[PDB]
Amino acid sequence: NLNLFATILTYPAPASNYRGESEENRSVIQKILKDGQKYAIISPESMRNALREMLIELGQPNNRTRLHSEDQLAVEFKEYPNPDKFADDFLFGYMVAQTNDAKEMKKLNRPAKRDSIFRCNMAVAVNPYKYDTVFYQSPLNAGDSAWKNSTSSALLHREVTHTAFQYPFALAGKDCAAKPEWVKALLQAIAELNGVAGGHARAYYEFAPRSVVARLTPKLVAGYQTYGFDAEGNWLELSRLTATDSDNLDLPANEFWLGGELVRKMDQEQKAQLEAMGAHLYANPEKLFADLADSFLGV
Amino acid sequence: NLNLFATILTYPAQKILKDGQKYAIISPESMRNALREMLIELGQPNNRTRLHLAVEFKEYPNPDKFADDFLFGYMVAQTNDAKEMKKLNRPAKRDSIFRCNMAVAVNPYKYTAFQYPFALAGKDCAAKPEWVKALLQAIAELNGVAGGHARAYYEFAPRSVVARLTPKLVAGYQTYGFDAEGNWLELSRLTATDSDNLDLPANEFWLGGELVRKMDQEQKAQLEAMGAPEKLFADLADSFL
Amino acid sequence: NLNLFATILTYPAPASNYRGESEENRSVIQKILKDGQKYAIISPESMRNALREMLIELGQPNNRTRLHSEDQLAVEFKEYPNPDKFADDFLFGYMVAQTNDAKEMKKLNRPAKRDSIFRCNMAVAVNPYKYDTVFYQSPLNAGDSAWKNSTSSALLHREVTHTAFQYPFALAGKDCAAKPEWVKALLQAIAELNGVAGGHARAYYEFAPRSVVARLTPKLVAGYQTYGFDAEGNWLELSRLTATDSDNLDLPANEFWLGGELVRKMDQEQKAQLEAMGAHLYANPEKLFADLADSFLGV
């Protein structure tokens, strides 16, 4: 079997994703700090929901569909999760945390367990500063209105940041019946990955990937330094030449795949030099995703 | 998908240095208010037609008529007459048809151009006739005045030549390429040859903001892209629709 | 006979391992505090189970296989542990704490005891701060589903930390019939050692080793300061030149093995100088593990 895992980054653009809501007066952004600096935003399960939403446009069955009618958030389910009957939200038949009986383990032998077949982690930014606001205001209708919102007009300040942040993920999965087309669709859909982290009609943003690198696809799990390339500069080529050197005499290497952004602006003679095994170079992420899916899937 | 990506436009002709090189000036909310009154000028009376001295109140926004009151026909109050669930069925819904972002200045601050990223991705939601009659007349012209309290209004023809991208859904065609003095938003992306490599573009060419505004060897570009000048921007949206 | 023992550490990456579960509202991580600071996480038995799980993929016999069918946690066994018949979960035939008789000591003279032939200790982090959350929510289905989960939607926040933590271990064992192959497989498996602290589809982490150091293989056990090299910097080189100095005139020393992360970045003249006995320098930990296993195993 083969296991693959990759890392991407996105284009730089101003963004604002309120996530904490510690107080109503002001919206907070920061999540975690390291080495005395505050960097990261965005939780992985938000991206999981984004993938769930995006998988619908490719024509696959679904069960957990979000509905917005009642005041509290709600997601409706189908009759019962079935990993083999359909996509089952990508083989995600989850637990039944109740003792109401009627479990399919009595009838359909369903063990109330999933097929995760995936993995990911939270994104981290590359710039620390988060002390900028917009300082706008909210008005009041006061026009003989039948409904009142807050009976006041006030001033509020949001929080903004101009930073591009990276994203690691690992799959390391295996294929079965009717699985390969689903996993190929997932690999196709992960390329675009827009409309992430909830709705944003005033702070437009996207997860368009540039300089994507996938590591050690044929061999077993040997991942290391997933958060390597940062500081708006390439860093996996120096790691490639140092760790698992290009030459196969002293330090052997393994098949690699490189994104288009890294090779877009770098020495052509360096491209010729970096041909010990040839590696895999491409100009756009979509083509390399297609080729990697074809190679890893075995078909 | 049947949605068009961002169409950044610039005017080559107040946070100060948010980072060490750039900053943000215009909030995203201002232009929406400016676009509100421009809608009225085009003979499209809306519901929330507040004079903005006096803010008025029309009936409940139960019908999603006149661009759904510009995409904010919601109510959040406690009762709202049982939240209008009797026979109206409008539970704080919010259409997402027009999306924008902050406009920044390319020129560093000294102790005049700006960019407006767009997002008109509406697929079948914006393709219905009740919105077809509106978008081609309320958004295509895109020629108005912003601000109003102070002399700050800039809507200029030069924009990136981008059209409907059906085979590939919304995906980054770069962002914030000023090209006021660089003229490189193409990023050497031409589909002159497709068998070997560099098959990136999909014939997005049109009469952009630098045909006669800049002299070069662009004559071969239209001989290569075959894509589909100030007023002609509104034509492309109408031509495809 | 020779006795080996080594220490490793991993790459820095955000991680979360809920281990306390004091209350349902929040999940706690911290385990122990020292010198007024709260550092360490993770228990040795987690790594023991991880090694047990990963020994299966290398083609070895097993008895204790975990199964998730009944509500309580369950692991099933074979007929009876046998240290010599097969791997016996790496010579781990444990006690029979019952007076039911039928013990093999009556028939096969099995003493109901083990061959542990191993030892380890809990990992300890290097950064104390733990005061950040993510503040996510759990929704309610309420979609005319036949089964209800909690009949409510709640708001709950996790706990995360960005730290890289080390790991000491000691073997100090001896080989017997059919044992060298099993111990070589164990040394091969300890290199990757992923999937620790159970599955994690939201907090991806791994134990890829960098700057692994092995100490005092030939002579009797004389380990000292196992948790030594910390503060994101090498500290065993100054200890090497001070304690058991490289020169063999005043303070005699012993054969050492140094990982790739340390030798990746120091002065080349420093590498040349540290050649009194030559020591043993390698660029990747896997080659070091292979060579050390070959040398210590005697074959």
| CB C109, CB C93: distance < 8 Å | no
Q: Chains A, C: CB contacts under 8 A, how many?
A: 120
Q: Which residue of A has its CA nearest to C190?
A: A222
Number of continuous H segments (helices) and E segments (strands) in chain C: 7, 13
| CB C207, CB C10: distance < 8 Å | yes
| CB C126, CB C230: distance < 8 Å | yes
Is C34 at the interface with chain A, CB within 8 A? Answer: no
Say how far apart CA A187 and CA C197 lie, in whole Å: 28
Is A69 at the interface with chain B, CB within 8 A? Answer: yes
Is A102 at the interface with chain C, CB within 8 A? Answer: yes
State the burial class of residue B206 (Cβ atoms within 10 Å of its Cβ: 0-12, 13-18, 19+): buried
Say how far apart CA B139 and CA B119 lie, in whole Å: 12
The H or E element that residue C13 is part of is strand C13-15
Which of helix, strand or coil describes residue C103?
coil
| CB A226, CB A79: distance < 8 Å | no
The DSSP letter of residue B203 is S
Is A28 at the interface with chain C, CB within 8 A? Answer: no
Residue window 103-132, chain A: list those with CB within 8 Å of chain C. 105, 111, 113, 116, 118-122, 124
How many CB atoms sit inside 10 A of residue C134's CB? 21
CA Rg, chain C, in Å?
A: 23
How many CB atoms sit inside 10 A of residue B166's CB? 12
- The nearest CA of chain C is from the CA of A62 a distance in Å of 14
Q: Which chains touch A (3 or more CB pairs under 8 A)?
A: B, C
Which of helix, strand or coil describes residue A177?
coil
Is C160 at the interface with chain A, CB within 8 A? Answer: yes
Which of helix, strand or coil describes residue C65?
strand
Judged by CB atoms closer than 8 Å, whether chains meet at A203 and B28 is answered as yes
Amino acid occupying residue B141: E
Interface test with A, best of C202, C205, C262, C281 (most A CBs within 10 A): C202
Say how far apart CA C256 and CA C215 lie, in whole Å: 6
| Cα torsion angle, B35, B36, B38, B39, sign | positive
CA Rg, chain A, in Å?
A: 23
Interface test with C, best of A18, A43, A244 (most C CBs within 10 A): A43
Say how far apart CA B82 and CA B78 lie, in whole Å: 9
Closest by Cβ to C143, choosing from A74, A168, A221: A74
Chain B residues in contact with A140 (beta carbon < 8 A): 55
Judged by CB atoms closer than 8 Å, whether chains meet at B93 and A142 is answered as no
Experimental technique used? Answer: cryo-EM
Angle C1-C6-C12 (CA atoms, 0-180°, nearest 5)?
165
Alpha-carbon dihedral of residues A250, A254, A258, A262, nearest 10 degrees?
A: -20
Q: What is the resolution of this structure in A?
A: 3.6
Phi/psi at A195 (nearest 5 deg)?
65, 45
The DSSP letter of residue A120 is B
Tokens in use for A113? 């367990």
Strands C257-258 and C32-34 come out as: unpaired
| CB A142, CB A149: distance < 8 Å | no
Terminal-to-terminal C-alpha distance of chain C: 14
Amino acid occupying residue A283: A
Say how far apart CA C13 and CA A121 lie, in whole Å: 10
How many CB atoms sit inside 10 A of residue C79's CB? 6
Is A144 at the interface with chain B, CB within 8 A? Answer: yes
Write out the DSSP string of C146-184.
SS-SSSS-EEEB---EEE--EEEEE------TTHHHHHH
Tokens in use for A139? 């008005």
Tokens in use for A295? 């190679």
Q: Which residue of C has its CA nearest to A226?
A: C13
| CB C96, CB C112: distance < 8 Å | yes
CA Rg, chain B, in Å?
A: 20
Mutual angle of helices A44-54 and A179-192, in 10-degree steps: 110
Q: Which residue of A has its CA nearest to C145?
A: A77
Cα dist from A40 to A167, B20, B70, B87, whole Å: 11, 20, 34, 46
Write out the DSSP string of B39-65.
HHHTT---S-----------S---S--
